[model samples]
Target chain A: SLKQQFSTKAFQAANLEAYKAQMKEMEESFGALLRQLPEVPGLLEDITRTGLGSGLEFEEIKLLPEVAQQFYIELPIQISVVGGYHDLATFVSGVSSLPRIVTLHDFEIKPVAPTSKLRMSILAKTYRYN
Target chain B: SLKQQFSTKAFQAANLEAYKAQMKEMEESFGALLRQLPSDTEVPGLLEDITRTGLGSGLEFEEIKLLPEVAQQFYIELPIQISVVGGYHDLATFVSGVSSLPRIVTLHDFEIKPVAPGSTSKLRMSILAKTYRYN
Candidate 1:
C-alpha cells in the first residue's frame, strides 16, 4: 500500500480541459454582461418616462457626458423639475427601481411658493458599457 | 514517431505552466494600476483639496457631509454632500476647479437656486460630489 502502482505513475496526458474551459467561460460571461447595458438614447427614454411617468414635470433635462472609466461610461443627467414633495419622491424612488441603473445624486427641493408647487433640482446618473 | 511527440505529456505540462504564469502576470500588472484609486484613510486629504479649491473661487460652504458609500459592480461611489452659496460665476469656477483635482471626484445631484425667490444676491447650490474607489 505504501508503494504507488506503476501503471498509475506512468506518463499520462496533462489534461487542462478544466482550466481552458474556465477561461473561455469567464470571458464569455463578461461579454454577455456588457451587452445588457442600455445605450445613451435608451437611457434617456427610460429616464424620461420614469420621471414624467411618476407625475413629476421636467423643467430642464440635459444629459452630460463624462470621461470613461476602465469598464463603463457614465451618462449624467441634470434634471430640474416642478412638482409636489410626494411627486418628487415618487420620481426619485421610481428611478432607483428602473431595469437599467440610474443613480440619484444631488436632490434639493425648494419652495416655489409657500402655497404652490415645490421645484426639485437633481442630478440623475446612469451608466453603460464603453 | 509523430504520435509519440504529440502525446509526450511533458509538452503540455510545460505549456500549462507558461499559461499559468502569463495569466498571473496580466492580473498582477493591473492590480498595481488599480492602487491609484483612493483608499479609506486618504479621504480627508481629498476633502482638504476640496476646501482649498472651493475658497479659491469665492465660494463658501454652508455645510459638507460625507454620505454612506455605495458599492457598484466595479467601483465604490462615495457621496460628499455639500451645501454652499456663491455667485453664479464663482460656482462655475469652483466646479471647474474641483474637476482639476488629482483625486477622482465627480459632482452630481446639483441644485442651483436662489437664496431667496424674491431676492437673488448669492445663490444657494447643493451638490453631491462623488469619489470613486477601486480595488
Candidate 2:
C-alpha cells in the first residue's frame, strides 16, 4: 500500500508530458459545461455566501511518475440534511450516483430519532487521470 | 394577511370545481416530468423521501369564488431537489429557456468548492418531466 502511495506521489509530481496531455479531455469537457450555464440572478450574493461558509480546507493529490497514469483523491465529506424522509432518500440517492466517478469509502449516520432526522458523514474518493 | 391566508386555504379546499380542474392540469404536468427522470436514480429516491417528510404538514388556501377565472391553493410545503450541482452552468442554462418547466429553483455553491483536491456536498433541485400533445 505504501508502495502504491509512493508511486502515485511520484507520478503526480513527475513530468509525464504524455499523461499531462491526456488531461485536455477533462479540462475541455468541464469548460464546455461551465460555458453553458446561464448567468444566475444572484451570482455575486451566492458566491459570497459560499465563500464564507467554506472554511479554508484544502488538499493535495500526489502521484508517482511511474504510476502517473491515474490519480486517486480522498477526503472527508459531511452532509447535514434537515428535511423529511423523502428529502433524505433523495439526498442519498443523488449522492450515490453523482455524475463523476466516485465511491463512498465510509459512512456514518447519526439519527435524530423522534423527528426522523439524520446527519450523515461520508468518506468518499474519486480516481482521475494523472 | 389573514384574508390572504384564508383565501388561499379556501382556494385549495373549496369546491370551485373549476379550480380542481386547474389542478388536473398541474398534476398531469408534474406527472409527465416524473416520467422522464432516469429510473432508480437519486432523483426518484429524493421524491419519495420528500413525500415521507411532508406527512402531516398540509397547507390549505381559500380564494373567493368571485370569478370562475381565478382560484388559489395553498398547503404546508416540502422540498424535492433532483440535481446536486455537479456542473455549474449546464443546469442554470438548461433550466433557463424552458425546454421544460418546474425544472430547477435554487442557487447553492455549498456543493462545489476547493479545486485540485476538491470535493463538494451541494444541494439543488431538478424536476425531470415529459409533455404529450393530444390529436
Candidate 3:
C-alpha cells in the first residue's frame, strides 16, 4: 500500500543519521583491513619469510608490476619454491592465515627430476584499497 | 491524504494485468541471458575447445590446470591456468581464439619468460584464463 511505502520514505528521512553512521562504521572496518597490509618491499619480505619459515626453498620470489583497478591496487607476486607436499600445504595455510590479506592463485606443482621433492610455482596476490 | 493513497492503489490495481505481462517478459529476458552462460558440466568440453584453439594456433601446452570455482550469488567463475610454449604471433592468435570461442573467457596473469636460457624465438607463457558459469 502507498501508506506503507510512504511511511518507509518518511522513516528513511527520519533515520538518515543512523543509517549513515552504520555505513561509516563499515567503511572504517574495511579501511582497517586495508591498513594492515604492508607496503611493497615489506610485503615481499613478509611473504618470503612466510614461505621460507614453512620449510620451503625459495627459487624465486619476484614482485610484478602492481595493477591499479577502478578501486583497489592489486599487487601480484610470482613465487617459485621447491618443497615436499606437506611443506607446500603448510606454506599455503600459513599465507592464508596471515594477519594481512593474501590470495594464492594458479599454482603449478611438478616434480623436479632426479629429486624426490616437488617444485611449486604459484602467484600470491594482495591488495591495497585506494 | 488517505484518499490520495487509496487512489494511487486503485491506479495500480487497474494496471495490474498489464504489469503482470511486463514482469513475465522481464523474466523471459533474464532466462535468455542465463542461456548464454556455460554450465559446470561443460568444463571439459570448454577445455577441449581451448586445447584445440592453442594447437591450431601452433602453440604447445606444457600445462593446463583447472582452478577452483568462485561462487557468486547468481553465477560461478571458473579459472584455468595454462602454460604454453610459443612465439609472439602464435600467442596472439591463441588469445584471439579465446574471443571467437562458443563460450566466453577472460585472460589474466600473462607472464612470458624464457623456456631455459632465454635463447631463440622459443618462450613460455604463464597465463590464467577464466570463464563464467550459470546454473
Highest-lDDT candidate = 3
Local accuracy by lDDT, each model: 0.56, 0.30, 0.58
Q: RMSD to the native, candidate 2?
A: 21.9
Chain B TM-score, candidate 1? 0.68
Interface RMSD of 2: 21.7
- Tens digits of per-residue lDDT for model 2 on A58-114? 122222233222232232333233333344444444444433333333333333441
What DockQ does model 1 achieve? 0.03
Question: How do the candidates rank by TM-score, highest first?
Answer: 1, 3, 2
Better of 1 and 2 by lDDT: 1
Stretches off by above 4 angstroms in model 2 are A1-71, B1-135
lDDT (tens digit, per residue) of candidate 3 on B1-135: 111222233334335555344333333332233333334455787789889999998899999988888764445678898999876567657866765665545555454554555242455766777766553
Off by over 4 Å in 1: A1-32, A36-42, A53-98, A101-130, B1-38, B68-78, B132-135
Chain A superposition TM-score per model: 0.65, 0.37, 0.66
| Candidate 3 Cα outliers beyond 4 Å, as residue runs | A1-130, B1-32, B35-38
